[PDB]
Design an enzyme around this catalytic site. Sequence first.
Site, mmCIF file in Angstrom:
data_model
loop_
_atom_site.group_PDB
_atom_site.id
_atom_site.type_symbol
_atom_site.label_atom_id
_atom_site.label_comp_id
_atom_site.label_asym_id
_atom_site.label_seq_id
_atom_site.Cartn_x
_atom_site.Cartn_y
_atom_site.Cartn_z
ATOM 1 N N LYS A 136 3.221 11.373 -3.719
ATOM 2 C CA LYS A 136 2.040 10.797 -4.365
ATOM 3 C C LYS A 136 1.117 11.894 -4.907
ATOM 4 O O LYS A 136 0.365 11.643 -5.843
ATOM 5 C CB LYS A 136 1.290 9.904 -3.360
ATOM 6 C CG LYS A 136 0.297 8.953 -4.014
ATOM 7 C CD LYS A 136 -0.147 7.911 -3.044
ATOM 8 C CE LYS A 136 -1.566 7.518 -3.306
ATOM 9 N NZ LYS A 136 -1.990 6.431 -2.382
ATOM 10 N N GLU B 211 -7.058 0.974 -4.572
ATOM 11 C CA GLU B 211 -7.126 0.901 -3.113
ATOM 12 C C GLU B 211 -8.506 0.377 -2.626
ATOM 13 O O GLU B 211 -8.506 -0.597 -1.866
ATOM 14 C CB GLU B 211 -6.778 2.265 -2.467
ATOM 15 C CG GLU B 211 -5.287 2.596 -2.498
ATOM 16 C CD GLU B 211 -4.927 4.070 -2.420
ATOM 17 O OE1 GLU B 211 -5.755 4.870 -1.922
ATOM 18 O OE2 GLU B 211 -3.812 4.425 -2.868
ATOM 19 N N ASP C 197 0.919 -1.135 0.000
ATOM 20 C CA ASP C 197 0.000 0.000 0.000
ATOM 21 C C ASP C 197 0.964 1.191 0.000
ATOM 22 O O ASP C 197 1.605 1.446 1.011
ATOM 23 C CB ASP C 197 -0.871 -0.008 1.274
ATOM 24 C CG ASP C 197 -1.685 1.261 1.506
ATOM 25 O OD1 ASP C 197 -1.709 2.131 0.604
ATOM 26 O OD2 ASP C 197 -2.297 1.388 2.594
ATOM 27 N N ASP D 274 -12.875 5.775 3.284
ATOM 28 C CA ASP D 274 -11.437 5.944 3.482
ATOM 29 C C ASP D 274 -11.074 7.319 4.010
ATOM 30 O O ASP D 274 -11.016 8.282 3.239
ATOM 31 C CB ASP D 274 -10.701 5.632 2.159
ATOM 32 C CG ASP D 274 -9.172 5.694 2.187
ATOM 33 O OD1 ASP D 274 -8.595 5.879 3.293
ATOM 34 O OD2 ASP D 274 -8.547 5.550 1.102
HETATM 35 MG MG LIG Z 1 -4.420 4.873 2.096
#
Ligand SMILES: [Mg+2]
Length: 390
Positions: free
Chosen positions: A73, A177, A12, A201
């Site tokens: 990211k 994800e 991840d 999330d």
């Molecule tokens: Mg995450």
Amino acid sequence: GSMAKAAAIGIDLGTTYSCVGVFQHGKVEIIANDQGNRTTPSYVAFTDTERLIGDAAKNQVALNPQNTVFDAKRLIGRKFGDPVVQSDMKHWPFQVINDGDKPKVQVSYKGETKAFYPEEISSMVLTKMKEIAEAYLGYPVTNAVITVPAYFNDSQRQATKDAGVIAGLNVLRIINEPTAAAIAYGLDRTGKGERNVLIFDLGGGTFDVSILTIDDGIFEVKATAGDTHLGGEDFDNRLVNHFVEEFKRKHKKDISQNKRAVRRLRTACERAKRTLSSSTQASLEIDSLFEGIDFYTSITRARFEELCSDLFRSTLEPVEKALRDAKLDKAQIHDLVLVGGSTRIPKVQKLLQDFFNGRDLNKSINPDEAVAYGAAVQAAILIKSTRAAA
Ligand SMILES: [Mg+2]
Ligand SMILES: Nc1ncnc2c1nc(Br)n2[C@@H]1O[C@H](CO)[C@@H](O)[C@H]1O
């Protein structure tokens, strides 16, 4: 005849924290790094003598802000001119430069000024996750599944693959994800018939909701929604402002101008925030915070819930937007899955459960680990090379 194959890993690669797992003996093991942490900060620091990655990079950030890179990211596969990039650069203490309309981070490293592409920084994070796995397995690791947000375009997905190749990994697959979080719960192994899954999330800096449909193990992303300005850091900021005011009332001193005192306060606040997820109150004990004054205080879970109340409630707006976009009603959702450490907040859980009229939430797999867990399950499936029997 045939030598046993090394295990494949699931990574991840997160904005703030990264996590690695491996599926062996019918189960997933989330692998702790050499400081005993199950998640590793996605931070890379540069000095005259070393390049530090993970916890070692994050622990020296205060005195080296210009040469410690985080949030790569948010830059990966984007153009320098992109309005997302331009806005984010105002919040970062490190330099982001323009090389052919592509962003690069520029630092002092080993006596020279060096610029790196965001995929090069991400490859340094992936190299650390590979070494964490090899320390546990006791042999070199080659194969990995890496996850990305569902909203990532082709350029962002290719740059993630490129980061993997630079780190010496064979990238088996780039997976979404929310799909990895569903796989972690085996939501793709329930047989025939359509199931609607909502993934909730809540990260350190962003909030994402995804609606997936699963039919015979086939995943379709039906809707995505979220808030780019909602995360764990905003709840930390609310506590910081609260204790700055408390110090002003009690000692008649404004501490907000001593960076060290603010940082020590913020560090203590993030830890008190974590304690409040399992306890009804938490103590704050800082020695010589400002002008040799010790700051020994407490905060109840009820006061913390009051301080962040508007922020917690605002998580339901992207939920309702995603449900409208998916053309579904809340009763039509079969499973609810929690992702991100901030979902451990009892009030966040209570608000969502009440929104879905008392439904159970899938939170049994640590929310900061669910994505890597699903990626490890997928990685073991992708390296199988069984030959059909007669
Ligand atoms: Mg995450
Ligand atoms: N138990 C927990 N209760 C409340 N919050 C938590 C917890 N564990 C984690 Br991890 N967090 C927060 O999740 C975010 C991850 O990027 C950070 O803001 C952490 O502070």
